[PDB]
Amino acid sequence: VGLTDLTFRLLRESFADAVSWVAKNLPARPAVPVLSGVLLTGSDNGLTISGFDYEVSAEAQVGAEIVSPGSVLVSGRLLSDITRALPNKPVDVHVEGNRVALTCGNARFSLPTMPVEDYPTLPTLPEETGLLPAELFAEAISQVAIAAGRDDTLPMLTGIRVEILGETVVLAATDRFRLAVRELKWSASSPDIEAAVLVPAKTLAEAAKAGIGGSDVRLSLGTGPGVGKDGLLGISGNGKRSTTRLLDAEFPKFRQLLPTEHTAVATMDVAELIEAIKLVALVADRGAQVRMEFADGSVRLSAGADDVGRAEEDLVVDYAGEPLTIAFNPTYLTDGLSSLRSERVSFGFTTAGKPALLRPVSGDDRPVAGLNGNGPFPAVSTDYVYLLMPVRLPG
Amino acid sequence: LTDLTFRLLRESFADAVSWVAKNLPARPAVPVLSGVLLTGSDNGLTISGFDYEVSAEAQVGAEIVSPGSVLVSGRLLSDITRALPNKPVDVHVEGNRVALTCGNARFSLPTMPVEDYPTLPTLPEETGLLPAELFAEAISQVAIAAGRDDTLPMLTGIRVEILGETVVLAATDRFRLAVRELKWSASSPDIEAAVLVPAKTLAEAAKAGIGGSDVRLSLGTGPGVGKDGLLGISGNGKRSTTRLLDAEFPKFRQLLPTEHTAVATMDVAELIEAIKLVALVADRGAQVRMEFADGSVRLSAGADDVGRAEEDLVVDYAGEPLTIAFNPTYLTDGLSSLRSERVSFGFTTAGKPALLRPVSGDDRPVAGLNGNGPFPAVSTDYVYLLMPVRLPG
Numbered sequence: 001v002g003l004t005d006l007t008f009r010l011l012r013e014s015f016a017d018a019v020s021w022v023a024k025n026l027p028a029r030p031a032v033p034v035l036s037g038v039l040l041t042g043s044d045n046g047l048t049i050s051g052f053d054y055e056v057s058a059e060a061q062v063g064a065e066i067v068s069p070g071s072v073l074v075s076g077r078l079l080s081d082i083t084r085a086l087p088n089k090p091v092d093v094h095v096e097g098n099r100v101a102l103t104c105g106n107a108r109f110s111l112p113t114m115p116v117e118d119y120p121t122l123p124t125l126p127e128e129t130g131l132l133p134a135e136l137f138a139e140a141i142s143q144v145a146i147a148a149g150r151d152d153t154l155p156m157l158t159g160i161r162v163e164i165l166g167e168t169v170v171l172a173a174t175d176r177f178r179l180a181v182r183e184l185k186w187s188a189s190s191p192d193i194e195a196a197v198l199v200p201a202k203t204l205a206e207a208a209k210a211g212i213g214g215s216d217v218r219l220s221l222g223t224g225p226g227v228g229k230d231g232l233l234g235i236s237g238n239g240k241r242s243t244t245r246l247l248d249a250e251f252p253k254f255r256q257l258l259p260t261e262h263t264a265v266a267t268m269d270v271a272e273l274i275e276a277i278k279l280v281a282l283v284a285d286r287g288a289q290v291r292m293e294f295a296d297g298s299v300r301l302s303a304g305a306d307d308v309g310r311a312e313e314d315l316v317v318d319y320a321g322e323p324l325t326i327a328f329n330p331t332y333l334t335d336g337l338s339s340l341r342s343e344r345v346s347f348g349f350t351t352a353g354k355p356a357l358l359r360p361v362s363g364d365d366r367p368v369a370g371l372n373g374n375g376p377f378p379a380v381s382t383d384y385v386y387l388l389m390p391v392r393l394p395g
Numbered sequence: 396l397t398d399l400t401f402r403l404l405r406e407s408f409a410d411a412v413s414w415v416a417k418n419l420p421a422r423p424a425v426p427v428l429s430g431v432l433l434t435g436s437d438n439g440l441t442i443s444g445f446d447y448e449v450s451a452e453a454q455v456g457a458e459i460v461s462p463g464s465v466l467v468s469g470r471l472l473s474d475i476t477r478a479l480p481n482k483p484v485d486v487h488v489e490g491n492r493v494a495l496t497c498g499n500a501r502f503s504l505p506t507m508p509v510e511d512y513p514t515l516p517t518l519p520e521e522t523g524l525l526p527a528e529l530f531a532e533a534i535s536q537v538a539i540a541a542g543r544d545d546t547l548p549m550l551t552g553i554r555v556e557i558l559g560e561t562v563v564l565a566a567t568d569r570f571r572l573a574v575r576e577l578k579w580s581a582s583s584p585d586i587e588a589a590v591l592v593p594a595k596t597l598a599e600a601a602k603a604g605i606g607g608s609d610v611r612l613s614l615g616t617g618p619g620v621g622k623d624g625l626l627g628i629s630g631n632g633k634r635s636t637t638r639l640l641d642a643e644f645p646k647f648r649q650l651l652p653t654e655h656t657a658v659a660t661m662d663v664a665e666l667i668e669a670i671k672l673v674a675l676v677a678d679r680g681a682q683v684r685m686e687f688a689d690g691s692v693r694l695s696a697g698a699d700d701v702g703r704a705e706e707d708l709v710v711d712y713a714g715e716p717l718t719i720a721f722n723p724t725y726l727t728d729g730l731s732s733l734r735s736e737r738v739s740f741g742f743t744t745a746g747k748p749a750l751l752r753p754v755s756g757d758d759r760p761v762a763g764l765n766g767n768g769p770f771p772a773v774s775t776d777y778v779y780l781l782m783p784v785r786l787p788g
Binding site (some may be wrong): 065075078081082085086106107108109110111112280282283305307308309310311312313314335347 | 471474475478479499500501502503504505669671673675676697700702703704705706707708744785
């Protein structure tokens with residue numbers, strides 16, 4: 001259907017990219033068989049590939065000499081496999097009605113065709129709500145996404161919380177053992193904009209790589225009194241764009257959970273501390289736990305087991321407060337430590353049954369008021385925080 | 396008096412240890428066998444592993460400040476040895492526990508009873524030797540064609556045949572035959588037996604031949620090359636033994652073509668890419684087909700969607716038009732192994748094995764109207780024989 005049949009000439013380099021970006025979303029085995037197709041559409045002077053699985057929906061637009069408009073549905077994985085395995089010659093697509101003739105050099109393909117009238121019109125895309133640099137959005141989404149619950153038996157934990165307080169945005173995710181919070185400055189579209197939504201975590205992290213080009217990605221939730229309404233979020237920028245259906249769940253109150261002051265405060269090198277963790281945990285005890293003895297200007301981490309496999313390492317910590325001994329799940333620990341994206345790290349303990357607080361450290365800012373070992377230290381502002389619960393094992 | 400203790404460079408300790416755990420992997424049957432055995436003596440340390448089939452043993456130069464031996468869990472040692480800094484490592488048996496120390500890293504590993512470890516095999520007398528890099532190349536070329544399936548051994552081994560001065564390697568999964576011909580320096584120029592060694596055990600030992608620049612097979616010598624039911628690869632610091640396989644192996648020289656009705660010659664590079672591409676639509680991967688005509692071949696797979704792909708490339712061909720079908724993996728496996736610039740096919744009919752062999756420089760490549768009627772087999776040191784394929788309706 002359409003009247004004519006689609007035919008075009010794309011550069012392959014460009015065809016292959018556009019196609020993979022669309023299959024990287026909506027993977028899996030879609031529920032209704034049709035949804036496994038992608039949709040190519042020639043018009044104006046550009047081609048648009050489109051995918052849709054009812055939750056997410058991607059769509060790329062590449063510049064291609066179309067020598068005849070139309071649209072066709074063709075199996076999506078097959079197109080992606082072929083597009084990546086082809087030479088680097090220009091590729092000649094041409095619908096011979098019911099079959100797609102694909103040609104690139106002396107390679108010739110005859111793919112079957114899916115009924116382009118069972119494809120259910122991918123969503124529209126709410127009105128722009130603001131924008132921010134693409135590389136910064138990526139960094140910010142990775143930092144927060146680690147702490148998101150990967151388990152499907154329970155959503156809510158599976159989302160990133162996006163809160164907009166016009167001009168600043170804050171990202172937060174949590175699996176119940178970690179909290180990652182990122183604070184951000186974007187260019188809003190209505191400087192009095194003010195809502196908060198919950199978007200599925202992977203859908204969002206995936207779209208943080210369609211932000212390499214664009215050098216400026218744009219969130220589209222809605223504008224004004226209808227930012228919530230319109231049950232979805234839209235990431236656009238460069239040639240790519242996507243929508244993900246928002247998550248209808250309430251998310252931990254969460255500012256309540258942060259420390260106001262810390263009884264102890266440490267500061268060692270991230271590099272060294274990671275290596276030291278990956279090493280003592282080899283004997284870990286099914287990987288369960290690593291422990292940190294904090295004293296004077298040194299910390300001794302140590303795991304050990306049912307063989308009593310015992311390992312320990314000592315490194316120098318710029319410490320302040322009374323000797324403290326705390327235990328962490330070693331993965332949660334290194335996850336947080338990778339994310340700080342910094343040279344060195346700063347721990348903030350209340351007691352040893354209460355969340356440690358990791359945040360980054362670049363240059364000797366503070367210290368400053370870190371001499372008075374005998375009593376509470378200030379929280380101190382920061383744009384990235386990782387809150388890590390301490391761990392317990394049974395006998 | 397005191398228990399083993401020593402000082403190794405880590406770089407050297409880590410290598411020696413991994414080489415011993417790369418063999419005898421899995422979950423050994425008797426629990427003890429999961430340990431490795433460190434032994435200090437003379438002025439060298441030797442790690443030893445053993446699983447009843449294979450048995451490796453590396454020897455590294457280490458300042459031992461006290462001789463002895465201890466058994467410690469093998470995977471744990473390998474994990475630790477690879478995760479340690481680059482400082483010198485201080486092992487020291489505090490009897491019942493091994494104290495391992497490398498910088499400010501300190502480990503206290505448990506100890507296994509070194510008297511349940513069952514004395515690893517002795518190693519038959521040297522039978523010959525050949526360059527290590529050539530032995531590796533030759534083992535990879537022949538090993539692809541070996542059957543990976545355990546329901547049936549025999550297909551699982553490489554056939555090593557020695558005809559003093561020349562050795563030949565052969566493996567087969569029943570659909571491919573790879574044969575490699577080799578010149579080594581024997582120990583008794585009238586040496587003459589043939590044995591079957593498990594295929595992986597041998598390919599694994601083809602990487603403990605990077606150093607040594609000269610690896611040495613030890614089956615026995617004279618009238619007792621067969622007897623002594625095992626093979627021994629040594630060289631550099633490493634050495635291993637593998638228990639030989641007691642099976643008869645396809646008669647196999649019978650299966651080669653004397654003459655070919657057709658003979659083709661195209662570029663290996665182009666042909667591989669072309670195969671990997673048309674097989675995307677392959678039909679569960681089952682088959683690729685080659686139409687041979689004049690000076691061009693058109694490969695093409697297609698399916699139940701009829702997913703149809705095809706590509707045309709230029710073949711230096713000689714004989715009457717032929718159309719043959721191969722399993723595409725078997726095909727590219729063979730094609731990788733030729734280790735050559737270009738390839739030469741040798742077809743009898745189209746229900747009979749093609750013959751792949753390498754081509755470097757215009758020695759004989761069609762060479763015109765030889766011609767049409769039968770072509771010569773032509774000697775070669777590496778041959779890949781690939782059965783054509785059939786699918787059911």
